[PDB]
Amino acid sequence: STMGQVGRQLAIIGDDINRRYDSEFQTMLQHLQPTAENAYEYFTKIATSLFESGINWGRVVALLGFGYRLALHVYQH
């Protein structure tokens, strides 16, 4: 039942993560204007340049979220 307590604190963290950077993702997507024909190439090099300048869990998270929004952007366009 303490599993709910820890689970509730992750819900706050995740909901805070979900809204804190959601706007910053869409700004990049508008400046990128990605399509199905360039999404893979855009994503792969962006990932390489991000990680070759350093990698940590937060950067992995930021890239995962970017890739998720990038996929949503391409599906809707």
- Closest contact distance (angstroms) between CB of 77 and a second copy is 18
Single out the residue of 9, 38, 71, 77 in contact with ligand PEE (rule: CB under 6 A): 71
Give me the DSSP letters along the chain: -HHHHHHHHHHHHHHHHHHHSHHHHHHHHHHH---TTTHHHHHHHHHHHHHHT---HHHHHHHHHHHHHHHHHHHT-
Single out the residue of 64, 66, 73, 76 in contact with ligand PEE (rule: CB under 6 A): 64
Question: What is the binding site for a second copy (CB under 8 A)?
Answer: 2-4, 6-11, 13-19, 21, 24, 28, 31-32, 42, 45-47, 49-50, 53-54, 56-66, 68
